[PDB]
């Protein structure tokens, strides 16, 4: 017997990401001998990106491939299921936390309460900022109307004085063009180029070579399926799909990084200047970020569990010192 699932991705049509996602659906058919077929839908095709969560919960969609932290406002734990400012910043660290330090189970338990089955994370990229204004130091963020993905990311930029705005990636170009926003933090170089941000913003803002991405060094996506639809899939196919997503996580990551390398030369020719903030700017953001980690971690039991296990890991690899944590607890 054959099963058919409709799954919408956060990737807009015409992006390297959507192409990768399409390819994934044929890999799934191959790995299941045609027994599990996924019909891909680009961002907005069935429901607005920010409403996918509820659309999957109710079953209009069988599943989704979102940027996990989009649900931070309704599920605090999701702010910890993707990178946050100055925390773990390498793909391998997130892989370790999810797959051996207990992250996958925390995520699954939190989503299960929502009637969703969190399959696993999908590696992706660090994020960059596109700005119409040259933001060369920490102090230049004050007063900047900045599109960000809400949650803890938005809070850190707000603490730096920015006026944060929540908008889907597909609405960023017109917002910049119309002056609704001055800058935008969406994804990496290749996809941002696909969407044309270089045409409406001549500056790319990045951290120092030591800390390239201050805010989102590991911007994870994932695959989350309606729980009822998941439970109806035979276990053999469930296990195959889990493996398929884990393989895709890195095939996706690899494809994005390839496109990114090819994108930098393009920005140069577009007349875009890549601006690098300093290590001092990183220290100013760090002082604001750590307290915010704790504020978000204490929201519920899931956010507490995710953050506590990530904090112990960070202590283990020298990413945080006891001194910096003075007065902070869960």
Instruction: Enumerate the known binding-site residues for substrate.
Output: 70, 127, 147, 186, 216-219
**Span 96-125, contacts to a copy of itself by CB under 8 A:** 96, 98-101, 123
Classify each residue of 239-261 as buried b or exposed e, where b means 16 or more C-beta atoms within 10 Å of its C-beta. ebbeebbbebbebbbebbbebbe
**Stretches 4-12, 176-184, 257-265, 269-277: which one binds a copy of itself (CB under 8 A)?**
257-265
What are the φ and ψ backbone dihedral angles of 28, each rounded to 5 degrees?
-70, -40
The structure tokens listed for 106 are: 């925390």
In the structure encoding, which two tokens stand for residue 125, read together? Answer: 């990229």
Cα 33 from chain centroid (whole Å): 31
Nearer to a copy of itself, 158 or 251 (CB): 251
Among 139, 239, 280, 300, which residue sits at the site for a copy of itself (rule: CB under 8 A)? 239
8 Å CB contact between 17 and 9: yes
Chain breaks in the chain (C to N over 2.5 A) after: none
Q: Which of 300, 324, 297, 322 is nearest to 309 (CA)?
A: 297
Q: What are the backbone angles phi and psi of residue 39, rounded to the nearest 5°?
A: -95, 110
Output 266 or 295, the one with its CB closest to a copy of itself: 266
Q: Does 95 interact with a copy of itself (rule: CB under 8 A)?
A: yes
Q: Residue 80 Cβ, how far from a copy of itself at the closest point, in Å?
A: 17
From residue 133 to residue 172, what is the string marking binding to a copy of itself with x (rule CB under 8 A)?
Answer: ----------------------------------------
End-to-end CA distance of the chain: 49
Residue choice 209, 322, 326, 327 for contact with a copy of itself (CB under 8 A): 209
In the complex, the smallest distance separating the C-beta of residue 288 from a copy of itself, rounded to whole angstroms, is 24
Cβ–Cβ under 8 Å, residues 149 and 215: no
Nearer to a copy of itself, 56 or 256 (CB): 256
- Out of 45, 166, 243, 330, name the contact with a copy of itself by CB under 8 A: 243
Q: Name the segment binding a copy of itself (CB under 8 A); options: 46-54, 61-69, 93-101, 290-298.
A: 93-101
Q: Is 321 among the residues that bind a copy of itself (CB under 8 A)?
A: no
Asked if residue 41 binds a copy of itself (CB under 8 A), the reply is no
Identify residues 165-204 at the interface with a copy of itself (CB under 8 A). Answer: none
- Here the tokens at position 180 are 């609704």
Strand ranges across the sheet with 273-276:
163-165, 145-147, 183-185, 129-131, 203-206, 273-276
Number of residues that bind a copy of itself (CB under 8 A): 34
The site for a copy of itself (CB under 8 A) is made up of 30-31, 33, 90-92, 95-96, 98-101, 123, 209, 236, 239-240, 243-244, 246-247, 250-251, 253-255, 257-258, 261, 264, 313, 316-318
């Amino acid at each position: 017997r054959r099963y058919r699932w409709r799954i919408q991705t956060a990737w807009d049509a015409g992006t390297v990401g959507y192409s990768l996602f399409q390819k994934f659906t044929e890999r799934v058919k191959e790995l299941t001998d045609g027994q599990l077929e996924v019909q891909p839908f680009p961002a907005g095709a069935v429901v607005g990106t920010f409403d996918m969560f509820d659309a999957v919960k109710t079953g209009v969609l069988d599943g989704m491939n979102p940027f996990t932290l989009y649900w931070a406002g309704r599920m605090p734990v999701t702010a910890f299921l993707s990178s946050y400012a100055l925390g773990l910043d390498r793909p391998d660290q997130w892989e370790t936390w999810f797959y051996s330090l207990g992250g996958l189970d925390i995520a699954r338990r939190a989503f299960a309460e929502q009637g969703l089955f969190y399959v696993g994370p999908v590696q992706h990229d660090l994020n960059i900022i596109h700005s119409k204004k040259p933001i060369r130091r920490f102090e230049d963020f004050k007063g900047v109307k900045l599109r960000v993905p809400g949650g803890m990311i938005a809070e850190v930029f707000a603490a730096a004085g920015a006026s944060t705005v929540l908008l889907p990636g597909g609405e960023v170009y017109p917002a910049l063009e119309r002056g609704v926003i001055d800058a935008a933090d969406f994804v990496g170089p290749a996809v941002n180029y696909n969407l044309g941000f270089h045409q409406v913003a001549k500056y790319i803002i990045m951290g120092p070579p030591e800390t390239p991405a201050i805010h989102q060094p590991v911007d994870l996506m994932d695959f989350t399926i309606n729980l009822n639809r998941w439970r109806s899939l035979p276990k053999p196919l469930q296990e195959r799909f889990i493996a398929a997503v884990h393989e895709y996580s890195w095939i996706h990551y690899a494809g994005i990084q390839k496109a990114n390398l090819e994108a930098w030369p393009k920005y140069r020719q577009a007349g875009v200047e890549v601006i690098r903030l300093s290590n001092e700017d990183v220290r100013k953001f760090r002082r604001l970020a750590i307290p915010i980690w704790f504020k978000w971690a204490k929201m519920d039991k899931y956010s507490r569990e995710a953050f506590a296990s990530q904090l112990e890991y960070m202590k283990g690899i020298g990413y945080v010192t006891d001194e910096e944590l003075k007065g902070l607890s869960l």
